[PDB]
Amino acid sequence: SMKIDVVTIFPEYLQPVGLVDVAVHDLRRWTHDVHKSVDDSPYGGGPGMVMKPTVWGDALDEICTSETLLVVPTPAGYPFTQETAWQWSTEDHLVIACGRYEGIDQRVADDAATRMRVREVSIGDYVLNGGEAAALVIIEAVLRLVPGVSLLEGPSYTRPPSWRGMDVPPVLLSGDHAKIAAWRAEQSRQRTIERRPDLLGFDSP
Amino acid sequence: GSMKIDVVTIFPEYLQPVRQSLPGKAIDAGLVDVAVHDLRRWTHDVHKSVDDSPYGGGPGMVMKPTVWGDALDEICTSETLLVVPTPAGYPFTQETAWQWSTEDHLVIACGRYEGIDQRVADDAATRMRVREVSIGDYVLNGGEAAALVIIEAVLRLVPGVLGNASLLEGPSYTRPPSWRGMDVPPVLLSGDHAKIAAWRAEQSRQRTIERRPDLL
Ligand SMILES: CN1CCCC[C@@H]1Cn1ccc2ccc(-c3n[nH]c(N)c3C#N)cc21
Ligand SMILES: CN1CCCC[C@@H]1Cn1ccc2ccc(-c3n[nH]c(N)c3C#N)cc21
């Protein structure tokens, strides 16, 4: 049983989402001024804008409890991996705070950490415009692990056994479980060495 | 630059996010076009079958090569960069996003279930460039979320699409100067911009050591 709340200034972007419920909240609901302003220029200089702590604080005050796991996507986060997804799969309540612009004032996470568990994480080594796509990835990876819901995968094949003059590897038609398991292990080894040598403790290309 | 992206998926509704996030100015200027295609348009049968049992046995289903082959035959040309998300892919990184941002035509083939029969990519690779990539070390249900990430990372690097007409980033702060007992680091308000840059560099150094020692 899991509840997921996502907070964002682009609730429309979260559209791609019994044991689990997902709710999406417009951060601007917690603004007061007429312009509904969520950002301001950075202290210390630099390009762009920073999301104000005040609006975030009010939103999280309402949505979070001390049991909440607050997830904050950021390119400067700890890596979000399958291990993380397993860890989070047994949580009762995830709140995902999606930033935009240059990000969220650091005091939002620091304040939250005084009363709940906070996790700043990155889904990969590339740059996005905001946390929303990361939220979608995290939700998908976690929800498929919720109770009641090493080597790279090798290639898969289905019918027909010959297509455009390309044959399904004959071993896969042999019915020999041991030979098939061995061939699959070898394809996975080839793939992992070639594409992800770091997974086997080798230098990255 | 002008980029066309075609996405093929059995869940086209999953991609409408991307089409919405695109600035009208970039579309009107013909800088970008994203089109999403339902794979079932290319099925052969009244049951609109896209999957079948795996040769060699095992769990799950495999997407059919004949359906995918027809879809890609129609959509791709010799100039296409065919992107195939897969957890067994080469890592998709910012370097990748930069490389792909100058392409004229990306086609993203989104799999589901166990993935796509390998002959689809292998056949495509004999007449176009094919890239099997993964967006990270976690398992998804299919390629659609990966497509969203790749599209966003690539398009924001295409001149015009964003507009205006190594180390980890450190913390950022804005008003108010004090909030819930927490003060913005005073150095940031000091007007000593050389010292501010050094402070930021050290914050970045510390964060990289703590969160991403692999980058060092
Ligand atoms: C661009 N713009 C200036 C520099 C830094 C980032 C900023 C955009 N931005 C704002 C909030 C926010 C949250 C997550 C991500 C994100 N990018 N890449 C990942 N793997 C991410 C995660 N997880 C990016 C975000
Ligand atoms: C689960 N199910 C059985 C095992 C293998 C994967 C499969 C699901 N699935 C089918 C097509 C497909 C494409 C990409 C991804 C994907 N997962 N994680 C990434 N970083 C990905 C990328 N990029 C998963 C996909």
**CATH at residue A201:** 1.10.1270.20
Among A103, A123, A149, the domain-final residue is A149
Ligand nearest to the CA of A136: 1
Residue B85 and residue B187 in one domain: no
| Residue B138 Cβ < 6 Å to ligand 2 | yes
Residue B88 exposed, middle or buried by CB count within 10 Å (0-12, 13-18, 19+):
buried
Test B53 with A85 for CB contact under 8 angstroms: no
Residue where the block lists tokens 């070898």: A186
Residue B16 and residue B83 in one domain: yes
Residue A140 and residue A154 in one domain: no
Q: What whole-number distance in Å separates Cα of residue A169 and Cα of residue B122?
A: 13
Residue A91 and residue A103 in one domain: yes
Which residue among A43, A84, A107 sits closest to B182, beta carbon to beta carbon? A107
Helix axes B144-155, A132-143, angle to 10 degrees: 160
Longest Cα–Cα distance of chain A, Å, equals 71
Task: Give the mutation target among A82, A83, A153, A199 for probing the ligand 2 site: most ligand atoms within 8 A of CB.
Answer: A153
Residue A142 and residue A165 in one domain: no
> Which residues, 6+ apart, have CB-to-CB distance to B142 below 8 Å?
B9, B11, B110, B111, B112, B113
- Written as six digits, the tokens of A18 are 């019994």
**Chain A residues lying within 8 Å of B86, measured CB to CB:** 153
Residue B196 and residue B119 in one domain: no
* CA-based nearest residue to A98, from A9, A4, A2, A22: A9
The count of other CB atoms within 10 Å of the CB of residue A140 is 20
Q: Dihedrals φ, ψ of B37, to 5°?
A: -125, 135
Q: Which residues line ligand 1 (CB under 6 A)?
A: A 73-75, 77, 99-103, 122-124, 126-131, 134; B 169
Residue B79 and residue B176 in one domain: no
Number of structural domains found in chain B: 2
Among B163, B178, B204, the domain-final residue is B163
Ligand nearest to the CA of A133: 1
Q: Is residue A48 within 8 Å of A103, Cβ to Cβ? A: no
Residue B125 and residue B197 in one domain: no
| Residue B11 Cβ < 6 Å to ligand 2 | no
Residue where the block lists tokens 């297509």: A163
Q: What whole-number distance in Å separates Cα of residue B92 and Cα of residue B101?
A: 13
The count of other CB atoms within 10 Å of the CB of residue A65 is 10
* CA-based nearest residue to A154, from A114, A95, A194, A198: A194
Q: Is residue B25 within 8 Å of B163, Cβ to Cβ? A: yes
Q: What whole-number distance in Å separates Cα of residue B16 and Cα of residue A188?
A: 34
| Residue B142 Cβ < 6 Å to ligand 2 | yes
Task: Give the mutation target among A56, A80, A129, A139 for probing the ligand 1 site: most ligand atoms within 8 A of CB.
Answer: A129
* Strand boundaries in A35-170, DSSP class E: 39-40, 50-51, 69-79, 93-97, 117-122, 162-163, 166-167
Among B129, B148, B163, the domain-final residue is B163
Experimental method: X-ray
Residue B87 and residue B117 in one domain: yes
The answer to the question of whether B138 is labelled as a binding residue is yes
Q: Is residue A25 within 8 Å of A8, Cβ to Cβ? A: yes
Q: Is residue A142 within 8 Å of A148, Cβ to Cβ? A: no
Question: What is the domain-level CATH number for residue B6?
Answer: 3.40.1280.10
- Written as six digits, the tokens of A205 are 């290309």
Residue A169 and residue A90 in one domain: no
| Torsion angle in degrees (nearest 10) through CA of B129, B135, B136, B140 | -110
Residue B63 and residue B74 in one domain: yes
Range of the domain at A177: 150-205
Q: What whole-number distance in Å separates Cα of residue A143 and Cα of residue A59?
A: 24
Q: What whole-number distance in Å separates Cα of residue A164 and Cα of residue B54?
A: 18
Q: Is residue A132 within 8 Å of A67, Cβ to Cβ? A: no
The answer to the question of whether A188 is labelled as a binding residue is no
**Chain A residues lying within 8 Å of B92, measured CB to CB:** 124, 126
B92-to-A125, A149, B60 alpha-carbon distances in Å: 8, 28, 26
Resolution in Å equals: 1.5
**Chain B residues lying within 8 Å of A49, measured CB to CB:** 174
Residue A202 exposed, middle or buried by CB count within 10 Å (0-12, 13-18, 19+):
exposed
Report CA torsion sign: A182, A85, A91, A19. negative
Using DSSP's 3-state secondary structure scheme, residue A150 falls into: coil
Nearest C-alpha of chain A: how many angstroms from B23? Answer: 13
Residue B38 and residue B85 in one domain: yes
* CA-based nearest residue to A22, from A9, A10, A6, A11: A6
Test A76 with B176 for CB contact under 8 angstroms: no
> Which residues, 6+ apart, have CB-to-CB distance to B126 below 8 Å?
none
